[PDB]
Structures are given as C-alpha cells and as structure tokens.
C-alpha cells in the first residue's frame, strides 16, 4: 500500500536542508544576489548563520548612516505592515514593481504575527544593501525587543537560526529611521503624531538608536493612532490616552490639520492599523481639500483569518494610485512553531489509554 | 505479572474472541463501541501483533497490557508512543508513516498539503544524524 518511508504528498516539494554560504549569497562585488536569495527563501531555505549575520549587520550599517527624517522624492511606492507574511511580500513587489526599477518606502512592522518574519528581514535588508538610495525602511512598533519577545519573532529566530541572529536584528532595528518627508508634501510615519512633536525639526533632534521608550515622542511616532471618531470630532482634546495600545495617544482631526498647516504638509501617511481594503482615506482637510490622514496596510488576510485586502500606495506623476492585492498561499506552521510530536503526543496517550480501559473493562 | 490479573485478562480475552479462535482479529476489536471511533485502534493492534499474523493471541495480549503497567517508567510510556508512529517497526520514524499516523488522528482537521509541510519540518528539525528518519533518541530530545 502507501509507502512508510517515501513522502505521501509528493506534490509538496521537500524543503532544502543546505544553508547558503557567503560565496553563494554575495557576488564578486560584494552585492547580495537577491534572485538567489528570493528563490531559496521561497522554498523555506536557510542561510548559514554567518551569512545571515552579514546581511543584518551590513544592512544595519547602511541604515545607521541615514537621518531620523528621510528625504524621499517622488515617484515612490509606499507600503504598510508586512508582519512576517513573506509570501505576500513577494506579491507586493510584483504589484508595486521590481526594486531594480522602482523606489520603495516601508512604514515598519516587518516581524511578528506571521511565521516568516526572519525571511522578511533578511530579504528586505539584502534589498537595502543592494538599493541603498532607492529602497527605504522605517521603524515600526514591532521592531523592538519589548514586542518580539512577547510575540513569536524571538522564538522564530531560535528555531530557524539562533538567538545571536535575533540579537543582531534588535541592534539593526535600532538603526531604523523614524520618519520620511516624501516629495516635500507627506509626513510618513508608522503610528502618527505626538503631543511633543509640532515641527519636522522635533523629529530631527531625536535620538533613535535605542529601544523605544514607554513614553515620549519616539514612542508616539511608533504607537499613536487616530481617534476612533476621527473627523466626527466631539472630543476637543488633541491627544488622549490610547486605550487600545496601552500607551501613547489618540490624535484628533484638528490635531492633524494644525500640524499639516504649521508644517506646510499635504497629508500624513501611516500604517499600524489593519484595514479591510488595505487602506483608509480619512476626512479631508478644510485647508487643503486633501485627506488629512491615510492608513496603508500591506498584510493581506492578516493572521490568516481577517480575509482583508492589502494595498500599497504608488505616488507618481501627481497621482495617488492605490493598488490592492489578495493573499497568496504559504507553507503551514503549527501555532508557535510547535512540532508534530509535541502536538500529537497528548492525543496519542489519551486515545491509547481510552482503548486499553474499554478493552479491559 | 500478578496471578489475579492473569485470570481476569483470560476472561476478558474470551469475551473478545467472538468466534472462539484463540486470537483476536481487528473486526473483533471493532465490536466494542468505544473503539469504533478511536482512530488509534489499528495502530495499537499492530503493535500488539508481534508476530505479524494480523491477529492478537493471548501471549501477545498479556505482553501488550504488561507494557501499560504502573511499574513502567516514563521511558516505557515513550517507547510505546514511539511505536505508534513507527508503522514498519524498523526502529525509526520515517516521513510516510509519520504522515499516515498523523492523518489517522487529524482526519479532516488539516489538508494533505498542510500536514505534509509540518511533517517535513519536524523531520528536518529533529533529525540530528542526517539519516532522514527519527530514531527513539531523537524522539526523546523533542518530547
């Protein structure tokens, strides 16, 4: 009958066990081979620890030289949360364009929730090494030690690589810029505004090479949210305690409009919030006639249950083109990277005990 | 084992031996209503069938329950659980049998693609000598 040694579902490719070496990941010039890396990571392949550490540290060195507030000219494809959905990230670049001929800006949250977070980091960092001046990465609230230890990113690193690789990621995440000034019109951040931030210079004078503090303007950039009644403003306070995140604040429609007018900004582009269509246009500013706030979310079918769309924002030729895309298949992991023996053994001992009890009566 | 237990198991063995053949067939095990929906019945029967004739004689029936004695340490519980997965009884858990045994337990709770993927991952993450199969030592380190 069915072989006890050969694989039953032969349609599933057996993942490669080899770990790529430095000579196989970096070419003669020292540039990463993103084609090799993409194909290998899509098969759930792994790199040698030293190679993974080299990608993380080399990418961190490029990030380390960048300012807190990036200056990015149009055209550019702005992207929201990825949350470790590496196979949806492959679809994202198909939708937005290849980084070989397309400028990109990512608003953070590359890790946690999805179970391919380290693949997302390695591939984005390699792209950052390859395209240091056309592909840009901002920091999200999940690129920190506080959250990756509470969620699955640290466990993911220890299963696929080592805690040393995790530790290298934490130091790299500290180098991530906090914000971007895009085409002199849009302030691009992960979370939103801060009561301690009223000008662009308030962002520039920040010290970002650290773990995000529990309070302060750096925390607010990464954690803040618009009011649930944004636009329908009955709460006349500009900043109130964020009861959903447990820290930072909610910011109101008057707060955003005042900031935009004080800094001559058209809109604020942010992420940090799952959306059914992958995007949300907030109430227009009476001063500009343009939406004061835009949320972008690039993780489709979030947590494999939300069944939401994802979108990126392609700004080119004075056109704000929203591009939606659906989720893609990905290999299956048991929750919290549990193996099948630890998963099934309590069921095994239970059913064999029931049988023995009913046979012996 | 205990003499009182030996006599009780002989009485139960007779009630299970419906055709009075001196050996328990798979159909005779399935006659019990609690075992009709237990997805591990066929695995335990094969484990007890140490000679491979498809049936369980009284000698196999005694030695099968002897392993479930309270005088067995945790290793005795893990060795029996190991044999649940090791269908071909070669001392190792291979890919096909691990999938098949898991498929019996999960039924429709996982599609075949998803199950094959986590079976692959477990074998890769647990095989420490490169043979491609999971020995009992490798099985202990995981559980």
């Amino acid at each position: 009958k069915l072989s006890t040694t050969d694989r039953v579902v032969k349609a599933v490719p057996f993942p490669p066990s080899h770990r790529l070496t430095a000579k196989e990941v970096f070419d003669n010039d020292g540039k990463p081979r993103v084609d090799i890396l993409k194909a290998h990571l899509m098969k759930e392949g792994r790199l040698e620890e030293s190679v993974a550490l080299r990608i993380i540290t080399e990418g961190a060195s490029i990030l380390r030289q960048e300012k807190n507030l990036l200056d990015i000219d149009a055209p550019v494809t702005v992207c929201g949360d990825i949350h470790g959905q590496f196979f949806d990230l492959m679809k994202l670049f198909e939708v937005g364009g290849s980084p070989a001929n397309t400028r990109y800006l990512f608003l953070g949250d590359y890790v946690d929730r999805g179970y391919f977070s380290i693949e997302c980091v390695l591939y984005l960092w390699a792209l950052k090494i390859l395209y240091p001046k056309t592909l840009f990465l901002l920091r999200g609230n999940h690129e920190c030690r506080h959250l990756t230890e509470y969620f699955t990113f640290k466990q993911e690193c220890k299963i696929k690589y080592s805690e040393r690789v995790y530790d290298a990621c934490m130091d790299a995440f500290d180098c991530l810029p906090l914000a971007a000034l895009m085409n002199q019109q849009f302030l691009c951040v992960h979370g939103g505004l801060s009561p301690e931030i009223n000008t662009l210079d308030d962002i520039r004078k920040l010290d970002r090479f650290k773990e995000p503090p529990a309070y302060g303007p750096m925390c607010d950039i990464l954690w803040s949210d618009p009011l649930e009644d944004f636009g329908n403003e009955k709460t006349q306070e500009h900043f109130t305690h964020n009861t959903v995140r447990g820290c930072s604040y909610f910011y109101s429609y008057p707060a955003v409009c005042e900031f935009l007018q004080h800094n001559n900004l058209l809109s604020i582009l942010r992420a940090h919030k799952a959306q059914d269509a992958g995007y949300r246009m907030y109430r227009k500013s009476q001063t500009t006639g343009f939406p004061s706030l835009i949320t972008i979310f690039s993780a489709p079918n979030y947590l494999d249950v939300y069944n939401n769309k994802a979108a990126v924002l392609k700004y080119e030729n004075n056109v704000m083109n929203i591009r939606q895309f659906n989720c893609s298949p990905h290999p299956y992991w048991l929750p919290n990277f549990m193996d099948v023996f630890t998963w099934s053994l309590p069921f095994v001992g239970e059913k064999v005990t029931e049988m023995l009890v009913n046979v012996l009566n | 084992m205990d003499a009182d237990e030996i006599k009780r198991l002989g009485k139960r063995f007779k009630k299970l031996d419906l055709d009075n053949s001196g050996s328990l067939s798979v159909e005779e095990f399935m006659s019990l209503p609690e075992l009709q929906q237990n997805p591990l019945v066929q695995r335990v029967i094969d484990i007890f069938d140490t000679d491979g004739n498809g049936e369980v004689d009284f000698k196999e029936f005694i030695e099968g329950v002897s392993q479930f004695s309270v005088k067995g340490d945790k290793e005795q519980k893990l060795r029996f659980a190991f044999r649940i997965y090791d269908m071909d009884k070669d001392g190792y858990i291979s890919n096909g049998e691990l999938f098949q045994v898991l498929k019996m337990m999960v039924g429709n709770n996982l599609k075949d693609t998803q199950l094959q993927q986590i079976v692959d991952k477990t074998i890769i993450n647990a095989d420490k000598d490169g043979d491609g199969r999971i020995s009992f030592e490798e099985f202990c380190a995981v559980v």
Binding site: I322, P335, W343 | -
Partner: peptide, 20 residues
C-alpha cells in the same frame, strides 16, 4: 474528542486598482 485538532501644482488625484 475523536480527532486531533489544531491548537488555538494642482492637488493629486487618488485612484484605485482593485485586486488581481
């Protein structure tokens, strides 16, 4: 429990390209 289960210039114009 009969089966093992899984554990728990002018203004910019805004345009849309729906999925697929």
């Amino acid at each position: 429990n009969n089966y093992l289960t899984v554990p728990a210039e002018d203004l910019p114009v805004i345009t849309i390209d729906p999925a697929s």
